[PDB]
Amino acid sequence: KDANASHPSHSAIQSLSFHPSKPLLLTGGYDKTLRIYHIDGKTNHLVTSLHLVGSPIQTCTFYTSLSNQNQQNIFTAGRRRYMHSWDLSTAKIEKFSRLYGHESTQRSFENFKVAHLQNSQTNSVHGIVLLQGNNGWINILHSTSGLWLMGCKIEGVITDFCIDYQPISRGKFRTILIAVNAYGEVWEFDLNKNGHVIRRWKDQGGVGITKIQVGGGTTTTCPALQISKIKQNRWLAVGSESGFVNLYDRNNAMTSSTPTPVAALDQLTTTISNLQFSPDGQILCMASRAVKDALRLVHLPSCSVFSNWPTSGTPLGKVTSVAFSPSGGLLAVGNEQGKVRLWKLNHY
């Protein structure tokens, strides 16, 4: 059953998120309403909904703290110069509007991600909010304090970024910011070492890049429930305006500094606006919001598109958001008509 068929939305579904440990799906869009649904597959009811007056939702993510599992938040942002955090533990809603000297580099909060950072002075893990800004800037803030921790600048027009984790020891890990501009040059920063650059490389082929996304390990889409569950990501995907997706195997791609992709996918002909991986990384879901029914599922490591699905009668619509379930093997596709359709992969 469709996820939001019980309580319809009044706009395109700009963002979808699954709770890390609960059967909850959060939808957000330009109608300024965050809607949380309990996902049964057969009833799919509405847990709650919150309307933020004057604040459209471009991106909204569930966050669950790695230290305390009772600390649960919803982080929400649109074109505005602020950001909202809803404490899910009357609603407790804080606003992050202060950038501690860097408002010139951050004019909007719409493109953000939430990650885990180990401070390594006390080996304590806290969440960080990474905001894309102008002039290649990414501003990284504490998720509770809202203080400006650090900032990483790449050259050229920054188009996307993502978070990778690398385990160092027992109970220790490092966080890497992977940022890509429109040319194809990719920077990798070590957030533990004051945000200094680990490495820089170039996307082979590489023009008009819109999306970058790691997969096969702990991602921002699928986080860890404890520090020992943190794994590195096997796959990296880069998606371009032309409809091309270059797919890199990280185990061989970290060495070259001009790596070769395992595959280059041209099944879609419009701009790649959604890249997602399964929690195991066996499926890469690539999608475009420019035309109708532009969603493809790619089997890895064979790098081959599935043939029987999707179908000429599949009601995908103009796919604006994609979410994978952490455990259930569900796929939620939110489109421009406000519908979030739900499917189950029977293998998972």
């Binding site: 202060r98 000297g101 304090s145 809202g146």
Partner: protein, 489 residues
Amino acid sequence: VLSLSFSHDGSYLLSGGWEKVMSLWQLETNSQQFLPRLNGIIIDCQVLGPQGNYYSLILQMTENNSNSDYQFLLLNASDLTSKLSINGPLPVFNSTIKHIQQPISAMNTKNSNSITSLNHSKKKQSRKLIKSRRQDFTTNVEINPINKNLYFPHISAVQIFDFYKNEQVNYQYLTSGVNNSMGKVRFELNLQDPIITDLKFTKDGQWMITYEIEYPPNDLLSSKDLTHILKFWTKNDNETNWNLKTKVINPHGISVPITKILPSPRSVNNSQGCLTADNNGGLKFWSFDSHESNWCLKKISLPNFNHFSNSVSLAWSQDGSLIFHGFDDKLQILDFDTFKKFESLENTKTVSEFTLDSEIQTVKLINDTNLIVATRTTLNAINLLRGQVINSFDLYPFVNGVYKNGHMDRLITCDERTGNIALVINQQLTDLDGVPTINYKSRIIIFDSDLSTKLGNFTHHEYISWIGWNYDTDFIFLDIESTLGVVGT
């Protein structure tokens, strides 16, 4: 810089001081973030929580020179909005109470102490308390007739205090001073914000009347003259804020202060008038005219004197026929309708002027029959119908030069339903050598309306600054330790 603190990981510095602005310095990029216009100067900063998600500040309100007014403020880190703010009562005592020292600043001001000034000022205040004849630490507090809320005038603002919850309802500025616009530093600390010296409620509780003095800055032609402003405020019982309806600038003439305010009985215009008296010997009557939708000066008694005295008290009969005006040693009875002196056609056994031994401090009309007059020496009861003094008591060994003029009305209050009187007497505890020490003791005596018998006699271990009658059978008193007690049935 009065307060310094670090974050836990040490990348940020919290600093605060006389500017009432809290600064967070990024120690990497040397850029700071401000939270300005706090309620007081920052004497303490702390970062709290495992992730530093709280800021705990201690803020002192240095506009009050009499006491150390601390506010404890816990701030949410993300919003920089107050999770909690904790006060006590904020009364402005007439003089500085024991062991209260002004904080250190760059230079010696009225609000602050310099580096050199602190050690001398502690000694000077201590030996002032030991040696000086005058010990006045009295405040004026109001009780709202509707809410039973205690109103403390705090210099240029008013604090509203919920008595039963022991908490604060509101804090509202009432003057046009510099106030919360900026934090005064260096020579700016010598500026004086306008002082609310009187506040009263109409019997209905719909109107609040505030009298204030605006002080000019130094080194000008206009540095000598003082502005006196009388303001009338209203509010609905739903909202908490008061709204300024009427403002009168120099209400008794230019540079003539108002000594006494007395709201009218219910019979006089549904308790929507007041009666203001100045030190030249003049009365004025103000009343709410609905057609003008404002307060209007309705009656005037001209001063017409070269006699200047701050010992002014008023009383008003419950039917509103008579006004008892005590000015210096004289006490007059005035008919309200003519607003002139009372004259009788028979002119037999009816004297409207009373000449007394010393200056009147309080006039209290208990019922229509009994009139208490407190002088600098004696406390007398006069029966108006009889024209005879019932009994007089000697207050001279207690109230000899201790209080300034018109400050015993803070100490004497009266019950209106049952007619009982409360009187409070403060005594300094003396050492075995004979030198009067710091410590004090207070006695509360509850008298009958005729002052014939003492219904109650209580001792309290601390100086009592203000006793007032709660509007149902209770007497609320305020210590100098900011505690509040009740002497009631």
